[PDB]
Design an enzyme around this catalytic site. Structure first.
Site, PDB file in Angstrom:
ATOM      1  N   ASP A 267       0.849  -1.220   0.000  1.00 30.11           N
ATOM      2  CA  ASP A 267       0.000   0.000   0.000  1.00 30.11           C
ATOM      3  C   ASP A 267       0.878   1.263   0.000  1.00 30.11           C
ATOM      4  O   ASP A 267       0.519   2.279  -0.603  1.00 30.11           O
ATOM      5  CB  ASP A 267      -0.977   0.044   1.216  1.00 30.11           C
ATOM      6  CG  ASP A 267      -2.378  -0.579   0.918  1.00 30.11           C
ATOM      7  OD1 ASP A 267      -2.501  -1.389  -0.028  1.00 30.11           O
ATOM      8  OD2 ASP A 267      -3.371  -0.256   1.633  1.00 30.11           O
TER       9      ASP A 267
ATOM     10  N   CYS B  92      -1.705   0.215 -14.234  1.00 27.01           N
ATOM     11  CA  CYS B  92      -1.882   0.364 -12.807  1.00 27.01           C
ATOM     12  C   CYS B  92      -2.959   1.425 -12.690  1.00 27.01           C
ATOM     13  O   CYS B  92      -4.002   1.256 -13.317  1.00 27.01           O
ATOM     14  CB  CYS B  92      -0.564   0.696 -12.081  1.00 27.01           C
ATOM     15  SG  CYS B  92       0.547   1.870 -12.940  1.00 27.01           S
TER      16      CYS B  92
ATOM     17  N   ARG C 205       3.986   1.806 -11.228  1.00 31.08           N
ATOM     18  CA  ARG C 205       4.165   0.357 -11.164  1.00 31.08           C
ATOM     19  C   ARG C 205       4.314  -0.219 -12.565  1.00 31.08           C
ATOM     20  O   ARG C 205       5.122  -1.106 -12.791  1.00 31.08           O
ATOM     21  CB  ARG C 205       2.981  -0.295 -10.448  1.00 31.08           C
ATOM     22  CG  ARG C 205       2.852   0.253  -9.047  1.00 31.08           C
ATOM     23  CD  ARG C 205       1.638  -0.343  -8.364  1.00 31.08           C
ATOM     24  NE  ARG C 205       1.396   0.293  -7.090  1.00 31.08           N
ATOM     25  CZ  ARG C 205       0.401  -0.041  -6.273  1.00 31.08           C
ATOM     26  NH1 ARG C 205      -0.436  -1.029  -6.600  1.00 31.08           N
ATOM     27  NH2 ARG C 205       0.249   0.623  -5.138  1.00 31.08           N
ATOM     28  N   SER C 206       3.506   0.258 -13.516  1.00 27.91           N
ATOM     29  CA  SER C 206       3.607  -0.230 -14.883  1.00 27.91           C
ATOM     30  C   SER C 206       5.008  -0.010 -15.446  1.00 27.91           C
ATOM     31  O   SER C 206       5.533  -0.852 -16.169  1.00 27.91           O
ATOM     32  CB  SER C 206       2.587   0.502 -15.769  1.00 27.91           C
ATOM     33  OG  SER C 206       1.279   0.150 -15.347  1.00 27.91           O
TER      34      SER C 206
ATOM     35  N   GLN D  61       7.566   6.703 -10.924  1.00 24.75           N
ATOM     36  CA  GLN D  61       7.053   7.955 -10.324  1.00 24.75           C
ATOM     37  C   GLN D  61       7.784   8.435  -9.040  1.00 24.75           C
ATOM     38  O   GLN D  61       7.468   9.498  -8.555  1.00 24.75           O
ATOM     39  CB  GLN D  61       5.572   7.795  -9.954  1.00 24.75           C
ATOM     40  CG  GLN D  61       4.657   7.745 -11.142  1.00 24.75           C
ATOM     41  CD  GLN D  61       3.176   7.597 -10.723  1.00 24.75           C
ATOM     42  OE1 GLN D  61       2.714   6.488 -10.466  1.00 24.75           O
ATOM     43  NE2 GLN D  61       2.443   8.708 -10.647  1.00 24.75           N
TER      44      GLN D  61
HETATM   45 CL    CL Z   1      -0.893   2.366  -9.075  1.00 30.69          CL
END
Ligand code: CL
Ligand code: CL
Ligand code: CL
Ligand code: CL
Ligand code: CL
Ligand code: CL
Ligand code: CL
Length: 279
Positions: A180, A214, A220-221, A261
């Site tokens: 998370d 994502c 994440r991608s 990111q």
């Molecule tokens: Cl995400």
């Protein structure tokens, strides 16, 4: 080698700095189409848009726009489509893209809700008997079966073009255990998930490009494609230590803005490639 570089960066605490160098050197290309008024409700985040040169175009007569980018890694010889988590009004566009691009696999890297916020529409059916029909793009989608594992789920989906009655089996690879907050202490389950996607054949050049998403389709991608490509480069090159992750990422960012990111995500990518290379 890469391992050495990793320790030096960690010793000197310069992840944030290297990541900001990446943001500064990144390509900037126009995103005119993404920013047209008629496309405002096809973008999940106004700050995350596909470049015009690499955007996926929908083929049907209507607005051709979806927030999705073709990442074609020439040297590694792999292509990916990176896209945002579909919105309630773009699920038909999403599956239309999978059809028209001839994808075999869809890689999802978030849960539909995380920390109690909506990151993605429920764009696939959860129950066999409750298929989805996308009336705008004339497609039907059916859950055929699902294999729920501890750290990911794989679903067999049947996508039917209701216009032609042709059907295709789509593999849905859902990584359900990305932390998370921050990134994983260890890349081990992310790497196992990557290898399961590979093993499935979804990344093969006989198929269209895998669709990876994502929430915004860059963080994440970006990690997933970056690791996969670096590992390809390490196994293909005469000199595997020549693989520069920062260079590979900059190359990817010619096709879609903002891949990776956070400096943690960058660090995690290094980890995943290092650990992965050993395997
Ligand atoms: Cl995400
Ligand atoms: Cl417009
Ligand atoms: Cl490449
Ligand atoms: Cl398991
Ligand atoms: Cl592979
Ligand atoms: Cl390189
Ligand atoms: Cl960025």
């Amino acid at each position: 080698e890469m391992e050495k570089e990793f320790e030096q960066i960690d010793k000197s605490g310069s992840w944030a700095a290297i990541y900001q160098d990446i943001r500064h050197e990144a390509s900037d290309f126009p995103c005119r189409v993404a920013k047209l008024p008629k496309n405002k409700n096809r973008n999940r985040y106004r700050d995350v848009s596909p470049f015009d040169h690499s955007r996926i175009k929908l083929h049907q007569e209507d607005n051709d726009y979806i927030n999705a980018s073709l990442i074609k890694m020439e040297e590694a010889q792999r292509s990916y489509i990176l896209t945002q988590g579909p919105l309630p009004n773009t699920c038909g566009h999403f599956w239309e893209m999978v059809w028209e691009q001839k994808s075999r696999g869809v890689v999802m890297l978030n849960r539909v809700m995380e920390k109690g916020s909506l990151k993605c529409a429920q764009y696939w059916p959860q129950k066999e008997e409750k298929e989805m029909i996308f009336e705008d793009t004339n497609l039907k989608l059916t859950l055929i079966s699902e294999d729920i594992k501890s750290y990911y789920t794989v679903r067999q989906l049947e996508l039917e073009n209701l216009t032609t009655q042709e059907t295709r089996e789509i593999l849905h690879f859902h990584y359900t255990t990305w932390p998370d907050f921050g990134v994983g202490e260890s890349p081990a389950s992310f790497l196992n998930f990557l290898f399961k996607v590979r093993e499935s054949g979804s990344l093969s050049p006989e198929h269209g490009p895998v669709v990876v998403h994502c929430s915004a389709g860059i963080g994440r991608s970006g990690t997933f494609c970056l690791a996969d490509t670096c590992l390809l480069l390490m196994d293909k090159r005469k000199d595997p230590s020549s693989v520069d992750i920062k260079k590979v990422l900059l190359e990817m960012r010619k096709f879609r803005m903002g891949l990776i990111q956070t400096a943690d995500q960058l660090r995690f990518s290094y980890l995943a490639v290092i650990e992965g290379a050993k395997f």
